[PDB]
Amino acid sequence: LYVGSKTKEGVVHGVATVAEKTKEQVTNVGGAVVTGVTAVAQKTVEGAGSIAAATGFV
Amino acid sequence: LYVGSKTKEGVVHGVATVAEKTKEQVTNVGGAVVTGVTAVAQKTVEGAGSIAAATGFV
Amino acid sequence: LYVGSKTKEGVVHGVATVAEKTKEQVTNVGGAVVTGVTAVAQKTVEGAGSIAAATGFV
Amino acid sequence: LYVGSKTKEGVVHGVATVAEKTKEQVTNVGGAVVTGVTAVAQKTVEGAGSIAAATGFV
Amino acid sequence: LYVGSKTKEGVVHGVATVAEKTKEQVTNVGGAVVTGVTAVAQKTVEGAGSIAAATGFV
Amino acid sequence: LYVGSKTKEGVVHGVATVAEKTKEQVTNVGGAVVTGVTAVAQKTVEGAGSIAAATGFV
Amino acid sequence: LYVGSKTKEGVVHGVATVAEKTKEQVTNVGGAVVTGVTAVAQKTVEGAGSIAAATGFV
Amino acid sequence: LYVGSKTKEGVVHGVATVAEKTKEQVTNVGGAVVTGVTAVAQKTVEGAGSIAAATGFV
Amino acid sequence: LYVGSKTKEGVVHGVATVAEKTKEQVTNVGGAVVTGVTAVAQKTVEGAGSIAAATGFV
Amino acid sequence: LYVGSKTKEGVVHGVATVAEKTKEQVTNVGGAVVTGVTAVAQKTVEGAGSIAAATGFV
C-alpha cells in the first residue's frame, strides 16, 4: 500500500574508477579548460543545472 | 497495491571505468576545451540542463 | 495491482569502459572542443537539454 | 493487473566499450569539434534535446 | 502504508577511486582550469547549480 | 637496438563484461559443474595447464 | 639498448565487470560446483596450473 | 642500457568490480562449492598452483 | 644501467570493489563452501599455492 | 647503476572497498565455510601458502 514510493530523482550508484599512469599536460592562455568530471548528480527545481562548461569570454 | 512506484528519473548505475596509460596533451588560446565527463545525471524542472559545453566568446 | 509502476525515464545502466594507451593531442585557437562524454543521462521538464555542444562565437 | 507498467522512456543498457591504442590528433581555428559521445540518454518534455552539435558562428 | 517514502533526491553512493602515478602538469595565464571533480551531489530549489565551470573573463 | 623486446606470453587485455538479469539454476548429484570463467591467463613451463575441467569420478 | 625488455608473462590488465540483478540458485549432493572465476593470472614453472576444476570423487 | 628490465610475471592490474542486487542461494550436502573468485594472481616456482578447485571426496 | 630492474612477481594493483544489496543465503551439511575471494596475490618458491579450495572429506 | 632494484614480490596496492547493505545468512553443520577474503598477500619460501581453504573432515 504505497503512495509515491521507491522514488529516485537524479541518482548515481555503483561507480568504480581506476587510473594508473595517465600523463596530462595542459597549456592555456585566456581560455577555459575542464577535465576530471566523475560521479556527480544534482537536482535543479528552477534554474540551469550545467556541468563542465567553459566560456573564454563574455 | 502501488501508486507511483519504483520510479526512476534521471539515473545511472552500474559503471566501471579503467584508464591505464593515456597521454593527453592539450594546447589552447582563447577557446573552451572539455574532456573527462563520466557518470553524471541530473534533473531540471525548469531550465536548460547542459553538460560538456564550450563557447569561445559571446 | 499497479498504478504507474516500474517506470524508467532517462536511464543508463550496465556500462563498462576500458582505455589502455590512447594518445590524444589537441590544439585550438578560438574554437570549442569536446571529447570524453561517457555515461550521462538527464531529464528536462521545460528547457533544452543539450550535451556535447560547441559554438566558437555568437 | 497493471496500469502503465514496465514502461521505459529514453533508456540505454548493456554497453561495453574498449579502446586500446587510438591516436587522435586534432587541430582547429574558429570551429567546433566533437568526438567521444558514448552511452547517453535523456528526456525532454518541452524543448530541443540536441547531442553532439557544433556551430562555428552565429 | 506509505506517503512519500524511500525518496532519494540528488544522491550518490557506492564510489571507489584509485589513482597510482598520475603526473599532471598545468600551465595557465589568465584562464580558468578545473580538474579533480569526484563524487559530489547537490540540490538547488531556486538557482543555478553549476559544477566545474570556468570563464576566463566577463 | 633490441634483444628480446616487447615480448608478450600468455596475455589478456581490454576486457569489458556486463550481466544484467541472468537467472541460472543448477542441480547436480555426483557430477562436476563449471560456469563463470572470465578473463584468465596463465603460463606453464612444465605441466598441464587446464582450465574449466570436470571429472565426475576416477 | 635492451636485453630482455618489456617482457610480460602471464598477465591480465584492463578489466571492467558489472553485475546488476543476477539470481543464482545452486543445489548439489556429493558433487563439485564452480562459478565466479574472474580476472586471475598465474605462473607455474614446474607443475600443473589448474583453474576452475571439480572432481566429484577419486 | 637494460638487463632484464620492466619484467612482469603473474600480474593483474586495472580491475573494477560492481555488484548491485545479486541474490545467491546455495544448498549443499557433502560437496564442495566455490564462487566469488576475483582479481588474484600468484607465482609457483615448484608446485601446483590451483585456484577454485573442489573435490567432494578422496 | 640496470641489472634485474623494475621486476614484478605476483602482483595486483588498481582494484576497486562495490557491493550494494547482495543477499547471500548459504546452507551446508558436511561440505566445504567458499565465496568472497578478492584481491589476493602470493608467491611460493617450493610448494602448492592454492586459493579457494574445498574438499568435503579425505 | 642498479643490482636487483625496484623488486616487488607478492604485492597488492591500490585497493578500495565499499559494502552498503549486504545481508548474509549462513547455516552449517559439520562443514567449513569461508567468506570475506580481501586484500591479502604473502610469501612462502618453503611450504604451501593456502588461502580460503575448507575441509569438512580428514
UniProtKB/Swiss-Prot annotation, chains A, B, C, D, E, F, G, H, I, J:
According to the record, mutating H13A results in: Impairs copper-binding
Q: What is the effect of changing H13Q?
A: In PARK1; no effect on protein structure; no effect on phosphorylation of the protein; no effect on membrane- and lipid-binding; increases oligomerization; increases fibril formation; increases secretion of the protein; impairs copper-binding
Region annotated 4 X 11 AA tandem repeats of [EGS]-K-T-K-[EQ]-[GQ]-V-X(4), chain positions = 1-30
Q: Spell out the subcellular localization from the entry.
A: Cytoplasm; Membrane; Nucleus; Synapse
**PTM comment, free text:** Phosphorylated, predominantly on serine residues. Phosphorylation by CK1 appears to occur on residues distinct from the residue phosphorylated by other kinases. Hallmark lesions of neurodegenerative synucleinopathies contain alpha-synuclein that is modified by nitration of tyrosine residues and possibly by dityrosine cross-linking to generated stable oligomers.
Q: Where are the sequence repeats?
A: 5-19, 20-30
Reading the lineage from the top rank, the first entry is Eukaryota
Provide the binding site for Cu cation: H13
Q: What is the effect of changing E9K?
A: In PARK1 and DLB; significant increase in binding to negatively charged phospholipid liposomes; increases oligomerization
Q: Which family is annotated?
A: Belongs to the synuclein family.
Q: What is known of its domains?
A: The 'non A-beta component of Alzheimer disease amyloid plaque' domain (NAC domain) is involved in fibrils formation. The middle hydrophobic region forms the core of the filaments. The C-terminus may regulate aggregation and determine the diameter of the filaments.
Q: What disease association does UniProt give?
A: Genetic alterations of SNCA resulting in aberrant polymerization into fibrils, are associated with several neurodegenerative diseases (synucleinopathies). SNCA fibrillar aggregates represent the major non A-beta component of Alzheimer disease amyloid plaque, and a major component of Lewy body inclusions. They are also found within Lewy body (LB)-like intraneuronal inclusions, glial inclusions and axonal spheroids in neurodegeneration with brain iron accumulation type 1.
Protein function? Neuronal protein that plays several roles in synaptic activity such as regulation of synaptic vesicle trafficking and subsequent neurotransmitter release. Participates as a monomer in synaptic vesicle exocytosis by enhancing vesicle priming, fusion and dilation of exocytotic fusion pores. Mechanistically, acts by increasing local Ca(2+) release from microdomains which is essential for the enhancement of ATP-induced exocytosis.
The protein's name is Alpha-synuclein
| Organism field | Homo sapiens (Human)
